[PDB]
């Protein structure tokens, strides 16, 4: 009995469907127009152009049906989609780390851990770019799509900034600790403490390629309580 149901949405799909090619093709056309024709230089403005191609196509009842039936540049769209999704990603993600908070209502495990899939999430982000990029820029720059925020002194640059950033914090949570209550450096847990800040500090250095002032005041403050 739910199968009424399920053959008579399919025919008012299929239905809609059929509608929206023949009511709706010079509209399907335009588009596809706009979308040959586009080019950008700055990535928002691709972001502006994606965004309104997305509210476009929304009404149409479904895209891969109604596409299917028209010359339609596929590669070119999904570039554009795809290029808007992961510069909107890594642009999440930058932020996501410059405005990082360490709760000090948590205690050092579950802050150290957070701090730790953080640089993780943000190393995995990193490398997926750096070994897809290549490919990428000679597909968008192809179609018209800019390529800059790609190179290392786009949001790659950024993103390795500010892990030096997250840096400060996770250090800032070590010594915090490590003052909070007053033990001996041969007590395993503040030792262990001690080198996670070390390691941690050292894994981002390598991973950004340098530190600043502050960030080196901090690894040096750390280095000199062994």
Same mark, same amino acid.
């Not at 929304?58 to 479904?62: C, N, Q, R």
């Given at each position: 009995n739910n199968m009424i149901g399920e053959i008579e949405n399919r025919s008012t799909f299929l239905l809609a469907v059929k509608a929206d090619v023949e009511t709706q093709g010079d509209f399907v056309q335009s588009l596809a127009t706009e979308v040959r024709a586009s080019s950008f230089t700055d990535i928002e403005d691709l972001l502006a152009f994606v965004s309104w191609l997305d509210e476009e196509l !929304?009404? /149409?009842?479904?895209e891969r049906a109604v596409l299917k039936h028209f010359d339609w540049p596929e590669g070119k769209a999904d570039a554009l989609r795809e290029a808007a999704f992961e510069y909107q990603d890594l642009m999440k993600l930058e932020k996501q780390v410059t405005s990082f908070v360490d709760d000090?209502? /948590? !205690?050092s495990e579950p802050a150290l851990k957070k701090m730790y899939k953080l640089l993780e999430k943000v190393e995995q982000s990193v490398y997926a770019l750096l070994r897809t990029r290549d490919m990428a820029i000679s597909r968008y720059k192809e179609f018209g799509i800019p390529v800059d925020w790609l190179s290392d002194t786009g949001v790659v640059g950024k993103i390795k900034l500010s892990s030096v950033q997250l840096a400060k914090k996770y250090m800032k949570r070590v010594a915090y600790e490590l003052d909070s209550v007053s033990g001996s450096d041969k007590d395993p847990n503040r030792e262990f403490l001690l080198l996670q800040g070390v390691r941690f500090a050292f894994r981002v250095h390598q991973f950004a390629g340098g530190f600043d002032a502050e960030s080196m005041k901090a690894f040096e403050e750390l280095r000199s309580r062994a």
């Open positions: !929304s009404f /149409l009842v479904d000090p209502n /948590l !205690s």
